[PDB]
């Protein structure tokens, strides 16, 4: 006899839900709730109320464009007293005259996103399915069973609910706290974040699978990361670092994420102008916090001291900056080995999805095979630099300084450097350097000898003594250097982007030093400083090698014409061979030496001397005494001055 039920309306209970699910701000118009936790609907009925003996109620939920039960994006479940742990359930908690209070639970591993809720009221012989409305399901750091679980309320407040923090800029020794409006709970943001997901490459590739996988805070974090700065047009931000931001808004101008998200949407999801590391991280932080993943912005600082070849190498992507900001998020990592639950580093700055998430403990341990993108993060806080100048650690460049983040629930900076790096020179810091960078050595060489005037080769002689092939970058350059420390213009430069070093091998990499280059930029030193920088860019380890080079003057040949008796009868033969490729003008000798002459014989030359063309002169000597005697010569030219020489006699 019993008639089917007619729903008057469905109360979403936005207040008590917003309160219990910590989504009070996101529940202005619409129900948003977190997973793994009961929420409340109240059915108002027109006429007869629910009677458990008569009516059988089923609910259906779908999320995304291709829901399926196997993928977790669809679920059907009854209304009944027995409530299973970790499943989609609905049960009654109150029943008055007209109303029926329901309590719904979602799995703690339920996919996040927008859901359509349907009800099927079957009364005896009949039934009628229809839509109730929509709830949005978020990540739940309060839920012990959730992967993003976080056991400290103060931390939950900080890394999820707090909508302002500090982003640290400046330098290692002058840190500045810049305040920031994350505004993850402002009008529109939640929807815009949801859009960001539904435009992501993996969603286009396979929308159904994508929505399924948004159960994983790893997956979402990875997706949240590479979408803030995409190489696509769909990405949120456009980077620019050349103080030329007149086209759009200046990276330094922004004080919040919110306005960037809106601009991006309101203009067909097109790159906002412009951003830099810390703007990307803030945007990622906002998006992540909004979706319920505990997140924070961090700043790592670097410092570089003395035109050291490193500074030169960079002065003219994966480079070394004054500082760099990325985000860390909080989740378990059952995709990895045990014990990597906790902070995971994510880098939304330039799978296209890079970088992360990767455990921060994996970086400190140097377990660089841990997914995702461990070497890239490791590179951001580790640079090994070594000199040779005949090993000798160089400190012209320090990376991994004062890694900083806002302290929990206070207007203060928290130094988190210890989480990334072991103490310098510790058993652990070395133990971990090993695990990372599983004999490599380089020097400068000349081979044949060097003459002022002549062109000649210098070699970066690199030796892979180990069993591992490396792919290195090589800068090999030469400048003139002064007796009193100054450095002159370039007189030889060879850059090599790709230099492979096959195991247990060597290379001698030539650079040509041309007269034409050095000749007019030289000083009386005759000093060329050759310098090789060898970059292994994966580990971010460097080998420096430098060597100074003296361009010797041409020898003066001296011969003893006559006989060596303790009497007289001697003559001098003194020759120089011009080593230049040019007319050597206004040539003269001087010769003298006590015991051989008492008349310094200056002889001038009217004939300019050519390249290779030598120049002999003569002088008559009247020796006097018996013992050892040394003749002494000087030579002068227009463009070649003060070349000496001597010769012993008896």
């Amino acid at each position: 006899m019993a008639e089917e039920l007619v729903l008057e309306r469905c109360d979403l209970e936005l207040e008590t839900n917003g309160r219990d699910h910590h989504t009070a701000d996101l529940c202005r118009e619409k129900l948003v709730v977190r997973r793994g936790q009961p929420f409340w609907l109240t059915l108002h009925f027109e006429g007869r109320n629910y009677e458990a003996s008569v009516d059988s109620l089923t609910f259906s939920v779908v999320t995304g464009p291709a829901p399926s039960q196997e993928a977790g994006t669809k679920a059907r479940f009854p209304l009944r007293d027995a409530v299973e742990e970790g499943d989609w359930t609905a049960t009654v908690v109150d029943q008055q005259d007209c109303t029926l209070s329901l309590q719904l639970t979602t799995p703690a591993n339920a996919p996040i996103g927008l859901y359509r809720l349907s009800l099927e009221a079957s009364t005896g012989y009949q039934g009628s399915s229809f839509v109730l409305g929509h709830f949005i399901l978020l990540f739940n750091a309060w839920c012990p069973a959730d992967a993003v679980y976080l056991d400290s309320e103060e931390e939950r407040q900080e890394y999820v609910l707090t909508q302002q923090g500090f982003i640290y800029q400046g330098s290692a020794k002058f840190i500045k706290n810049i305040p920031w409006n994350f505004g993850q709970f402002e009008d529109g943001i939640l929807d815009i974040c949801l859009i960001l997901l539904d435009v992501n490459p993996k969603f286009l590739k396979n929308a159904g699978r994508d929505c399924s996988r948004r159960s994983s805070p790893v997956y979402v974090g990875r997706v949240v990361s590479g979408m803030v700065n995409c190489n696509d047009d769909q990405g949120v931000l456009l980077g620019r670092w050349d103080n030329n931001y007149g086209d759009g808004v200046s990276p330094m101008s922004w004080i919040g994420s919110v306005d960037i998200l809106r601009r991006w949407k309101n203009h067909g999801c097109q790159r906002v102008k412009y951003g830099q590391c810390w703007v990307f991280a803030a945007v990622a932080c906002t998006v992540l916090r909004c979706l319920g993943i505990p997140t924070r912005v961090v700043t790592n600082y670097n410092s570089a001291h003395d035109s050291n070849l490193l500074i030169e190498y960079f002065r003219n992507s994966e480079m070394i900056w004054n500082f760099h900001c990325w985000v860390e998020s909080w989740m378990t990592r059952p995709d990895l080995q045990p014990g990597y639950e906790g902070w995971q580093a994510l880098d939304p700055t330039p799978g296209t999805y890079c970088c992360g998430p990767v455990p921060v403990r994996a970086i400190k341990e140097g377990d660089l095979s841990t997914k995702y993108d461990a070497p890239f993060v490791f590179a951001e806080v580790n640079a090994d630099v070594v000199d040779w100048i005949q090993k000798s650690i160089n400190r012209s460049l320090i990376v991994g300084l004062k890694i900083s983040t806002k302290s929990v629930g206070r207007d203060e900076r928290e130094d988190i450097t210890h989480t990334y790096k072991y103490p310098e020179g510790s058993s652990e810091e070395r133990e971990a350097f090993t695990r990372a960078n599983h004999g490599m050595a380089m020097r400068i060489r000349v081979g044949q000898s060097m003459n002022m005037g002549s062109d000649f080769d210098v070699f970066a002689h690199i030796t892979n003594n180990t069993a591992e092939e490396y792919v290195c970058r090589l800068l090999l350059c030469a400048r003139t250097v002064s007796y009193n420390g100054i450095l002159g213009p370039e007189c030889g430069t060879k850059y090599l982007l790709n230099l492979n070093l096959e195991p247990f091998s060597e290379k001698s990499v030539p650079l040509c030093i041309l007269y034409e280059k050095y000749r007019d930029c030289l000083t009386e030193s005759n000093l060329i400083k050759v310098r090789a920088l060898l970059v292994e860019p994966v580990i971010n380890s460097y080998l420096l090698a430098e060597r100074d080079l003296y361009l010797e003057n041409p020898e003066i040949k001296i011969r003893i014409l006559g006989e060596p008796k303790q009497k007289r009868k001697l003559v001098a033969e003194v020759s120089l061979q011009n080593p230049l490729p040019v007319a050597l003008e206004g040539c003269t000798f001087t010769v003298e030496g006590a015991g051989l002459t008492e008349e310094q014989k200056t002889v001038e030359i009217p004939d300019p001397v050519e390249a290779g063309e030598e120049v002999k002169v003569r002088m008559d000597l009247l020796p006097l005494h018996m013992g050892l005697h040394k003749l002494v010569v000087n030579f002068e030219s227009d463009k070649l001055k003060a070349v000496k020489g001597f010769r012993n006699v008896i």
Binding site: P251, N302, L397
Partner: peptide, 5 residues
Amino acid sequence: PALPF
């Protein structure tokens, strides 16, 4: 600004 060394 974020500055390259």
